[PDB]
Amino acid sequence: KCPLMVKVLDAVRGSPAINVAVHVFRKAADDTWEPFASGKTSESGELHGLTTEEEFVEGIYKVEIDTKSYWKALGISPFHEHAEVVFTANDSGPRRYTIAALLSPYSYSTTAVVTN
Amino acid sequence: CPLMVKVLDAVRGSPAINVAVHVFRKAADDTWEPFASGKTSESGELHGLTTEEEFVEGIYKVEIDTKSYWKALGISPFHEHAEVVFTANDSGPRRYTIAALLSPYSYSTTAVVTNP
Amino acid sequence: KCPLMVKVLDAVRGSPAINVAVHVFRKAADDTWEPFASGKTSESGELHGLTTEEEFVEGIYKVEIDTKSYWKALGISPFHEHAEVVFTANDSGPRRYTIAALLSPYSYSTTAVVTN
Amino acid sequence: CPLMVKVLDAVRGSPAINVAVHVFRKAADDTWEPFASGKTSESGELHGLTTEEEFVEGIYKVEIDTKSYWKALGISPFHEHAEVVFTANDSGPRRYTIAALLSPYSYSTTAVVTNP
Ligand SMILES: O=C(O)CCON=C1c2ccccc2-c2ccccc21
Ligand SMILES: O=C(O)CCON=C1c2ccccc2-c2ccccc21
């Protein structure tokens, strides 16, 4: 909710993308990705409550949005296995990161909106 | 070829073929005058709309008839058309590619401008 | 607020696009665009209160987002005069239209999120 | 040329030149193996990464090193890189164009897939 929030929209139906699985990982010292947090988007296509200010320290993070299962459930053949968003969290910046993703079967866009 | 239009379909991951495109130029009386038109090819591209001589400085609108496109595929889309409005050649002649990426409830448009 | 809301984001700064002028028009019987509603986006990049359920009847509407002035204020040279979103409002659909726009100097995307 | 990568800069309205691109293929042990790499040309395109013979069915990741790109232009961007993960050739060989459109806090990626 507070420091990291994910929002997913469906460009085909013009709707929130509901029940999309989302996994967050943090990069470890041996360069592997450690599970950090996960959830499914709500009816408003949002996922809040992933982490806390205390836990969300500087580091490299990856957000993986399971887009292929979403399109499969709709009966629409998709290109990507999942959308991945990789970034370094930085304390000098604003306190709240919203990772937004706009999905189509053969294309996606992602935007970070970083606010105080 | 100072003006080229390229249209892609984000649902099918393909060129958007046979899409109507109308170009207008703003007249002295602030009205939109017809300038040129055509339909995208099998590669989703429309070349030959104008010439360097004809393509003078001015404000231009490129209307891409996306609703007709989606309707012919059985889809009822949100937008009537994608409109792209810009001032051209104000620093001297340039080569413009107007790209549009289409989904039923979303589109994006990008200009790629090169100095000949 | 209720039936029509506009949201604008800045892809360069990863922020809401604040103080962007937005004009809405409705198409008249003589095929001209009549001013309908307008405003400036807030600090959260949103514009609410444009119209009411009573006033927002079926018809063709155009939302014009004054992107060029926004980029000029930032000292960044932009391509488009403005982003235009043209659509037919339809009572058979959901009750609430959010027109979202993601802005970069040479590209923009727009998405309609239509909800109940 | 079964795999081509095209990268555009949405701030400058130009090809994104000299951008590093790394392709990986998922191995039998579920790890990512290096497959091919290169840098975009003056046209923002990268051709010649692979051959029809080499490009067998599998899961592929295309990593586009967008952070290095923006840094060299004086911009500190949000993402580390744009990642594009997909299953290839599962219905037989195809020709794939992976396009990426870049802004400092946003990117979009689109696949255009043609049957030879
Ligand atoms: O943090 C903030 O101020 C808001 C975070 O973003 N909200 C977004 C939002 C809300 C409603 C409908 C569409 C969108 C959207 C589309 C593309 C990109 C971002 C956003
Ligand atoms: O937004 C996105 O994901 C991509 C938007 O552009 N795609 C483009 C694209 C895709 C395949 C082949 C050629 C082109 C191209 C040429 C000139 C200008 C733009 C684009």
Coordinates of C-alpha atoms and ligand atoms in Angstrom, one line a residue:
Chain A
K1 CA 0.0 0.0 0.0
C2 CA 2.3 2.6 1.3
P3 CA 5.7 2.3 -0.4
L4 CA 5.1 -0.1 -3.3
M5 CA 1.8 -0.6 -5.2
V6 CA 1.1 -2.4 -8.5
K7 CA -1.7 -1.4 -10.9
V8 CA -2.6 -3.4 -14.0
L9 CA -5.0 -2.5 -16.9
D10 CA -6.4 -4.4 -19.8
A11 CA -6.2 -2.4 -23.1
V12 CA -8.4 -4.9 -25.0
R13 CA -11.4 -4.7 -22.6
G14 CA -10.7 -1.1 -21.2
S15 CA -10.8 -2.5 -17.7
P16 CA -8.8 -3.2 -14.6
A17 CA -7.0 -6.5 -15.0
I18 CA -8.4 -8.5 -12.1
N19 CA -6.9 -11.6 -10.5
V20 CA -3.5 -11.3 -12.2
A21 CA -0.7 -12.9 -10.2
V22 CA 2.2 -10.6 -9.3
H23 CA 5.5 -11.7 -7.8
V24 CA 8.2 -9.3 -6.4
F25 CA 11.8 -10.5 -5.9
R26 CA 14.9 -8.8 -4.5
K27 CA 18.4 -9.4 -5.9
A28 CA 20.7 -11.3 -3.5
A29 CA 24.5 -11.0 -3.0
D30 CA 25.0 -14.1 -5.2
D31 CA 23.0 -12.4 -8.0
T32 CA 20.0 -14.6 -7.7
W33 CA 16.4 -13.4 -7.3
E34 CA 14.9 -14.1 -3.8
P35 CA 11.2 -14.1 -3.4
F36 CA 10.1 -10.9 -1.6
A37 CA 6.3 -10.5 -1.8
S38 CA 3.4 -11.5 -4.1
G39 CA -0.4 -11.3 -4.4
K40 CA -3.2 -11.1 -7.0
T41 CA -4.7 -7.9 -8.3
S42 CA -8.1 -6.8 -6.9
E43 CA -11.3 -5.9 -8.7
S44 CA -9.8 -2.5 -9.3
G45 CA -6.6 -4.1 -10.8
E46 CA -4.5 -3.0 -7.8
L47 CA -2.3 -4.8 -5.5
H48 CA -1.5 -3.1 -2.2
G49 CA 0.2 -4.3 1.0
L50 CA 3.1 -5.9 -0.7
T51 CA 5.7 -4.5 1.7
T52 CA 6.4 -2.0 4.5
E53 CA 8.7 1.0 4.7
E54 CA 10.9 -0.9 7.1
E55 CA 11.3 -3.8 4.7
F56 CA 11.6 -1.9 1.4
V57 CA 15.3 -0.9 1.6
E58 CA 17.5 0.2 -1.2
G59 CA 18.4 -2.7 -3.5
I60 CA 17.5 -4.1 -7.0
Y61 CA 13.9 -5.4 -7.3
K62 CA 12.0 -7.3 -10.0
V63 CA 8.2 -7.2 -10.4
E64 CA 6.9 -10.1 -12.5
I65 CA 3.3 -9.8 -13.7
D66 CA 1.8 -13.1 -14.9
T67 CA 0.2 -11.8 -18.1
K68 CA 0.1 -15.1 -20.1
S69 CA -2.3 -16.8 -17.6
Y70 CA -4.5 -13.7 -17.7
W71 CA -4.8 -13.8 -21.5
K72 CA -5.2 -17.6 -21.5
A73 CA -8.2 -17.3 -19.2
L74 CA -9.8 -14.9 -21.7
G75 CA -9.2 -17.2 -24.6
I76 CA -6.8 -14.8 -26.2
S77 CA -3.4 -16.0 -27.5
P78 CA -0.6 -13.9 -26.0
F79 CA 3.0 -13.3 -26.9
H80 CA 4.8 -12.8 -23.6
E81 CA 5.3 -15.3 -20.7
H82 CA 5.1 -12.3 -18.3
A83 CA 5.9 -8.6 -18.0
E84 CA 9.0 -8.0 -15.9
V85 CA 9.9 -4.6 -14.3
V86 CA 13.4 -4.3 -12.9
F87 CA 14.6 -1.3 -10.9
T88 CA 16.8 0.0 -8.1
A89 CA 15.0 1.4 -5.1
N90 CA 16.6 4.7 -4.1
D91 CA 16.1 6.6 -0.9
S92 CA 17.0 10.0 -2.3
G93 CA 13.8 9.8 -4.4
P94 CA 10.1 10.0 -3.5
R95 CA 8.7 7.7 -0.9
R96 CA 6.0 5.9 -2.9
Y97 CA 6.5 3.7 -6.1
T98 CA 3.5 2.8 -8.2
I99 CA 4.3 0.3 -10.9
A100 CA 1.6 0.5 -13.6
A101 CA 1.2 -1.9 -16.5
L102 CA -1.0 -1.6 -19.5
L103 CA -1.6 -5.0 -21.2
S104 CA -2.4 -6.1 -24.7
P105 CA -1.9 -9.7 -26.0
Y106 CA 1.2 -8.8 -28.1
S107 CA 2.3 -5.6 -26.3
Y108 CA 2.7 -4.1 -22.9
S109 CA 3.8 -0.8 -21.4
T110 CA 5.0 -0.2 -17.8
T111 CA 5.4 3.1 -16.1
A112 CA 6.8 4.0 -12.7
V113 CA 5.0 6.8 -10.9
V114 CA 7.1 8.0 -8.0
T115 CA 5.5 10.3 -5.5
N116 CA 5.7 11.8 -2.0
Chain B
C1 CA 9.1 10.6 -48.7
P2 CA 8.9 13.3 -46.1
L3 CA 5.7 11.7 -44.4
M4 CA 5.2 8.0 -43.7
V5 CA 2.5 6.4 -41.5
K6 CA 3.0 3.0 -39.9
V7 CA 0.2 1.2 -38.0
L8 CA 0.5 -2.0 -35.8
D9 CA -2.1 -4.2 -34.2
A10 CA -1.2 -5.0 -30.5
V11 CA -3.9 -7.8 -30.3
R12 CA -2.6 -9.9 -33.2
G13 CA 1.1 -8.7 -33.2
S14 CA 0.8 -7.8 -36.9
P15 CA 0.7 -4.9 -39.2
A16 CA -2.7 -3.2 -39.4
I17 CA -3.6 -3.6 -43.1
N18 CA -6.0 -1.5 -45.2
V19 CA -6.4 1.2 -42.5
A20 CA -7.7 4.5 -43.8
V21 CA -5.6 7.5 -43.1
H22 CA -6.6 11.2 -43.7
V23 CA -4.1 14.0 -43.5
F24 CA -5.3 17.7 -43.1
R25 CA -3.5 21.0 -43.0
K26 CA -4.7 24.1 -41.1
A27 CA -5.6 26.9 -43.4
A28 CA -5.3 30.6 -43.1
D29 CA -8.9 30.8 -41.7
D30 CA -8.0 28.3 -39.0
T31 CA -10.1 25.5 -40.7
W32 CA -8.8 22.0 -41.5
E33 CA -8.2 21.6 -45.3
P34 CA -7.8 18.1 -46.9
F35 CA -4.1 17.4 -47.7
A36 CA -3.7 13.8 -48.6
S37 CA -5.1 10.3 -47.8
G38 CA -4.5 6.6 -48.4
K39 CA -4.7 3.1 -46.8
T40 CA -2.0 1.1 -45.2
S41 CA -0.4 -1.7 -47.1
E42 CA 0.2 -5.3 -46.2
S43 CA 3.2 -4.1 -44.2
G44 CA 0.9 -1.7 -42.3
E45 CA 2.7 1.3 -43.9
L46 CA 1.5 4.2 -46.0
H47 CA 4.0 5.8 -48.2
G48 CA 3.6 8.5 -50.9
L49 CA 1.2 10.8 -49.2
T50 CA 3.2 13.9 -50.2
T51 CA 6.4 15.4 -51.6
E52 CA 9.0 17.6 -50.2
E53 CA 7.7 20.5 -52.3
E54 CA 4.1 20.1 -51.2
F55 CA 4.9 19.4 -47.5
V56 CA 5.5 23.0 -46.4
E57 CA 5.5 24.4 -42.9
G58 CA 2.2 24.3 -41.2
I59 CA 0.0 22.5 -38.6
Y60 CA -1.0 19.1 -39.8
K61 CA -3.5 16.5 -38.5
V62 CA -3.2 12.8 -39.3
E63 CA -6.4 10.9 -38.6
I64 CA -6.2 7.1 -38.5
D65 CA -9.5 5.4 -38.9
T66 CA -9.1 2.8 -36.2
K67 CA -12.8 2.2 -35.4
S68 CA -13.5 0.9 -39.0
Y69 CA -10.4 -1.3 -38.6
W70 CA -11.6 -3.0 -35.4
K71 CA -15.2 -3.2 -36.5
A72 CA -14.1 -5.3 -39.6
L73 CA -12.4 -7.7 -37.2
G74 CA -15.6 -8.0 -35.1
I75 CA -14.5 -5.7 -32.3
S76 CA -16.3 -2.7 -31.0
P77 CA -13.5 -0.3 -29.9
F78 CA -13.6 2.8 -27.7
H79 CA -12.1 5.4 -30.0
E80 CA -13.5 6.9 -33.3
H81 CA -10.0 7.4 -34.7
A82 CA -6.4 8.1 -33.5
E83 CA -5.6 11.8 -34.2
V84 CA -2.0 13.0 -34.5
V85 CA -1.6 16.9 -34.6
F86 CA 1.7 18.5 -35.0
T87 CA 3.6 21.5 -36.5
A88 CA 5.8 20.5 -39.4
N89 CA 9.1 21.7 -40.9
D90 CA 9.3 24.8 -38.7
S91 CA 13.0 24.4 -38.4
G92 CA 13.3 23.4 -42.0
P93 CA 12.3 20.2 -43.9
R94 CA 12.4 16.9 -42.0
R95 CA 11.4 13.3 -42.6
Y96 CA 8.5 12.2 -40.3
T97 CA 7.3 8.7 -39.5
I98 CA 4.0 8.6 -37.5
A99 CA 3.6 5.3 -35.9
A100 CA 0.4 4.1 -34.2
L101 CA 0.0 1.0 -32.0
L102 CA -3.6 -0.1 -31.7
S103 CA -5.7 -2.0 -29.1
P104 CA -9.5 -1.8 -28.8
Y105 CA -9.5 0.5 -25.8
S106 CA -6.1 2.0 -26.1
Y107 CA -3.6 3.4 -28.6
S108 CA -0.2 5.0 -28.6
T109 CA 1.4 7.2 -31.2
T110 CA 5.0 8.0 -31.7
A111 CA 6.8 10.3 -34.1
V112 CA 10.3 9.5 -35.4
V113 CA 11.8 12.5 -37.0
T114 CA 15.0 12.5 -39.1
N115 CA 16.9 15.4 -40.7
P116 CA 17.6 14.6 -44.4
Chain C
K1 CA -15.8 13.0 -11.0
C2 CA -18.6 10.6 -11.5
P3 CA -19.1 9.8 -15.1
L4 CA -16.0 11.3 -16.8
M5 CA -12.5 11.7 -15.3
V6 CA -9.2 12.5 -17.0
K7 CA -5.8 11.3 -15.7
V8 CA -2.5 12.4 -17.1
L9 CA 1.0 11.0 -16.3
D10 CA 4.5 12.2 -17.3
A11 CA 6.7 9.3 -18.6
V12 CA 9.9 11.4 -18.5
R13 CA 9.7 12.4 -14.8
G14 CA 7.6 9.4 -13.6
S15 CA 5.0 11.7 -12.0
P16 CA 1.5 13.0 -12.4
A17 CA 1.3 15.7 -15.0
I18 CA 0.1 18.6 -13.0
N19 CA -1.5 21.8 -14.3
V20 CA -2.2 20.5 -17.8
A21 CA -5.1 22.1 -19.5
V22 CA -7.9 19.8 -20.7
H23 CA -10.8 20.7 -23.0
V24 CA -13.8 18.5 -23.7
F25 CA -16.1 19.1 -26.7
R26 CA -19.3 17.5 -28.0
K27 CA -20.0 17.1 -31.7
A28 CA -23.0 19.2 -32.8
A29 CA -25.6 18.5 -35.6
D30 CA -23.6 20.6 -38.1
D31 CA -20.5 18.5 -37.4
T32 CA -18.7 21.2 -35.4
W33 CA -17.1 20.7 -32.0
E34 CA -19.0 22.7 -29.2
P35 CA -17.2 23.4 -26.0
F36 CA -18.5 21.1 -23.3
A37 CA -16.3 21.2 -20.2
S38 CA -12.6 22.0 -19.3
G39 CA -10.2 22.3 -16.4
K40 CA -6.5 21.8 -15.4
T41 CA -5.2 18.6 -13.9
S42 CA -4.5 18.6 -10.1
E43 CA -1.4 17.7 -8.2
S44 CA -2.3 14.1 -8.7
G45 CA -2.6 14.6 -12.4
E46 CA -6.4 14.1 -12.3
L47 CA -9.3 16.2 -13.4
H48 CA -12.7 15.5 -11.8
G49 CA -16.0 17.3 -12.0
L50 CA -16.1 17.8 -15.7
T51 CA -19.7 16.8 -16.1
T52 CA -22.7 15.2 -14.5
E53 CA -24.6 12.0 -15.3
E54 CA -27.6 14.2 -16.4
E55 CA -25.4 16.2 -18.9
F56 CA -23.2 13.3 -20.2
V57 CA -25.7 11.9 -22.7
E58 CA -24.8 9.6 -25.7
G59 CA -23.0 11.5 -28.5
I60 CA -19.5 12.0 -29.9
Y61 CA -17.0 13.6 -27.6
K62 CA -13.4 14.9 -28.0
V63 CA -11.0 15.3 -25.1
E64 CA -8.0 17.6 -26.0
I65 CA -5.0 17.5 -23.6
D66 CA -2.7 20.5 -24.0
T67 CA 0.5 18.6 -24.0
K68 CA 2.7 21.1 -25.9
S69 CA 2.4 23.8 -23.2
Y70 CA 3.2 21.2 -20.6
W71 CA 6.5 20.2 -22.2
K72 CA 7.3 23.9 -23.0
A73 CA 7.1 24.8 -19.4
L74 CA 9.6 22.0 -18.7
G75 CA 12.0 23.2 -21.3
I76 CA 11.6 20.1 -23.4
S77 CA 10.9 20.3 -27.1
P78 CA 7.7 18.3 -28.0
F79 CA 6.3 16.9 -31.2
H80 CA 2.5 17.1 -30.8
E81 CA 0.3 20.2 -30.5
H82 CA -2.0 18.3 -28.1
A83 CA -3.3 14.7 -27.5
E84 CA -6.8 14.2 -28.8
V85 CA -9.2 11.4 -27.7
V86 CA -12.4 11.0 -29.7
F87 CA -15.1 8.5 -28.7
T88 CA -18.9 7.8 -28.7
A89 CA -20.4 7.7 -25.3
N90 CA -22.7 4.6 -25.1
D91 CA -25.3 3.9 -22.4
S92 CA -25.2 0.2 -22.9
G93 CA -21.7 0.2 -21.4
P94 CA -20.4 0.9 -17.9
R95 CA -21.2 4.1 -16.2
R96 CA -17.8 5.6 -15.6
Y97 CA -15.2 6.6 -18.2
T98 CA -11.6 7.3 -17.2
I99 CA -9.5 8.7 -20.0
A100 CA -5.9 8.1 -19.1
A101 CA -2.9 9.6 -21.0
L102 CA 0.8 8.8 -20.6
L103 CA 3.0 11.5 -22.1
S104 CA 6.4 11.7 -23.6
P105 CA 7.8 14.5 -25.7
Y106 CA 7.6 12.6 -29.0
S107 CA 5.0 10.0 -28.0
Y108 CA 1.8 9.5 -26.1
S109 CA -0.6 6.7 -25.2
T110 CA -4.3 6.9 -24.2
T111 CA -6.4 4.4 -22.6
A112 CA -10.1 4.3 -21.7
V113 CA -10.9 2.5 -18.5
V114 CA -14.7 2.0 -18.4
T115 CA -16.2 0.7 -15.1
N116 CA -19.4 0.4 -13.0
Chain D
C1 CA 16.6 -13.1 -40.0
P2 CA 14.1 -14.8 -37.6
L3 CA 14.8 -12.3 -34.7
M4 CA 15.1 -8.6 -35.0
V5 CA 15.2 -5.9 -32.2
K6 CA 14.1 -2.3 -32.9
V7 CA 14.5 0.4 -30.2
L8 CA 13.1 4.0 -30.3
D9 CA 13.6 7.0 -28.0
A10 CA 10.3 8.7 -27.1
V11 CA 12.0 11.8 -25.7
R12 CA 14.0 12.7 -28.8
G13 CA 11.7 11.0 -31.4
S14 CA 14.7 9.1 -32.8
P15 CA 16.2 5.6 -33.1
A16 CA 18.0 4.6 -29.9
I17 CA 21.5 4.0 -31.2
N18 CA 24.2 1.8 -29.7
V19 CA 21.9 0.1 -27.2
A20 CA 23.2 -3.2 -25.8
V21 CA 20.9 -6.2 -26.3
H22 CA 21.4 -9.6 -24.7
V23 CA 19.4 -12.7 -25.6
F24 CA 19.1 -15.8 -23.4
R25 CA 17.5 -19.2 -23.8
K26 CA 16.1 -21.3 -21.0
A27 CA 18.1 -24.5 -20.5
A28 CA 17.0 -28.0 -19.5
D29 CA 17.9 -27.2 -15.9
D30 CA 15.6 -24.1 -15.9
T31 CA 18.6 -21.7 -16.0
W32 CA 19.1 -18.8 -18.5
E33 CA 21.9 -19.6 -21.0
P34 CA 23.5 -16.9 -23.2
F35 CA 22.2 -17.1 -26.8
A36 CA 23.3 -14.0 -28.7
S37 CA 24.0 -10.3 -28.2
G38 CA 24.7 -7.1 -30.1
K39 CA 24.1 -3.3 -30.2
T40 CA 21.5 -1.4 -32.1
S41 CA 22.7 0.4 -35.3
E42 CA 22.1 4.0 -36.4
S43 CA 18.6 3.0 -37.4
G44 CA 18.0 1.7 -33.8
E45 CA 17.8 -1.9 -35.2
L46 CA 19.7 -5.1 -34.4
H47 CA 19.8 -7.7 -37.1
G48 CA 21.8 -10.9 -37.4
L49 CA 21.4 -12.2 -33.8
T50 CA 20.6 -15.7 -35.0
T51 CA 19.7 -18.1 -37.8
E52 CA 16.7 -20.1 -38.6
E53 CA 18.7 -23.3 -37.7
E54 CA 19.9 -22.0 -34.4
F55 CA 16.5 -20.4 -33.3
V56 CA 14.8 -23.5 -32.2
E57 CA 11.7 -23.8 -30.0
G58 CA 12.2 -22.6 -26.4
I59 CA 11.7 -19.8 -23.9
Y60 CA 13.8 -16.8 -24.8
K61 CA 14.6 -13.6 -22.9
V62 CA 15.6 -10.4 -24.7
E63 CA 17.2 -7.9 -22.3
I64 CA 17.6 -4.3 -23.6
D65 CA 20.1 -2.3 -21.5
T66 CA 18.1 0.9 -21.3
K67 CA 19.7 2.3 -18.1
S68 CA 23.1 2.5 -19.8
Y69 CA 21.5 4.2 -22.7
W70 CA 19.8 7.0 -20.6
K71 CA 22.8 7.5 -18.4
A72 CA 25.0 8.3 -21.5
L73 CA 22.5 11.0 -22.3
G74 CA 22.7 12.5 -18.8
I75 CA 19.4 11.0 -17.5
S76 CA 18.9 8.8 -14.5
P77 CA 16.1 6.4 -15.5
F78 CA 13.8 4.2 -13.4
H79 CA 14.4 0.8 -15.0
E80 CA 17.6 -1.3 -15.1
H81 CA 16.6 -2.8 -18.4
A82 CA 13.6 -3.7 -20.5
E83 CA 13.1 -7.5 -20.4
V84 CA 11.0 -9.3 -23.0
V85 CA 10.3 -13.1 -22.2
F86 CA 8.4 -15.3 -24.7
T87 CA 8.1 -18.8 -26.0
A88 CA 9.3 -19.1 -29.6
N89 CA 8.5 -21.2 -32.7
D90 CA 6.1 -23.5 -30.8
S91 CA 3.8 -23.6 -33.7
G92 CA 6.7 -23.8 -36.2
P93 CA 9.3 -21.2 -37.2
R94 CA 8.2 -17.6 -37.3
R95 CA 9.9 -14.2 -37.9
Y96 CA 9.9 -12.0 -34.8
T97 CA 10.4 -8.3 -34.4
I98 CA 10.7 -7.1 -30.8
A99 CA 10.2 -3.4 -30.6
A100 CA 10.8 -1.3 -27.5
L101 CA 9.8 2.4 -27.1
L102 CA 11.8 4.1 -24.3
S103 CA 11.2 7.0 -21.9
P104 CA 13.1 7.5 -18.7
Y105 CA 10.3 6.3 -16.4
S106 CA 8.4 4.2 -18.8
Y107 CA 8.8 1.8 -21.7
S108 CA 6.6 -0.3 -24.0
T109 CA 7.4 -3.4 -25.9
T110 CA 5.6 -4.9 -28.8
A111 CA 6.1 -8.1 -30.8
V112 CA 5.3 -8.2 -34.5
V113 CA 5.3 -11.9 -35.6
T114 CA 5.1 -12.9 -39.3
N115 CA 4.8 -16.4 -40.8
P116 CA 7.5 -16.9 -43.5
Ligands
LIG1 O1 0.6 7.2 -8.3 C1 -0.3 7.8 -8.9 O2 -0.4 9.1 -8.9 C2 -1.3 7.0 -9.8 C3 -0.5 5.8 -10.3 O3 -0.9 5.5 -11.6 N1 -2.1 5.4 -11.9 C4 -2.7 5.1 -13.1 C5 -4.1 5.0 -13.3 C6 -5.3 5.1 -12.6 C7 -6.5 4.9 -13.2 C8 -6.6 4.6 -14.6 C9 -5.4 4.4 -15.4 C10 -4.2 4.6 -14.7 C11 -2.8 4.5 -15.3 C12 -2.4 4.2 -16.6 C13 -1.1 4.1 -16.9 C14 -0.1 4.4 -15.9 C15 -0.5 4.8 -14.6 C16 -1.8 4.8 -14.3
LIG2 O1 5.2 1.4 -28.5 C1 5.8 0.4 -28.9 O2 5.8 -0.7 -28.2 C2 6.4 0.3 -30.3 C3 5.8 1.5 -31.1 O3 6.5 1.5 -32.3 N1 6.7 0.5 -33.0 C4 7.4 0.4 -34.2 C5 7.6 -0.9 -34.9 C6 7.4 -2.2 -34.7 C7 7.8 -3.1 -35.7 C8 8.5 -2.7 -36.9 C9 8.7 -1.3 -37.1 C10 8.3 -0.4 -36.2 C11 8.4 1.1 -36.2 C12 9.0 1.9 -37.1 C13 9.0 3.3 -36.8 C14 8.4 3.8 -35.7 C15 7.9 3.0 -34.7 C16 7.9 1.6 -34.9

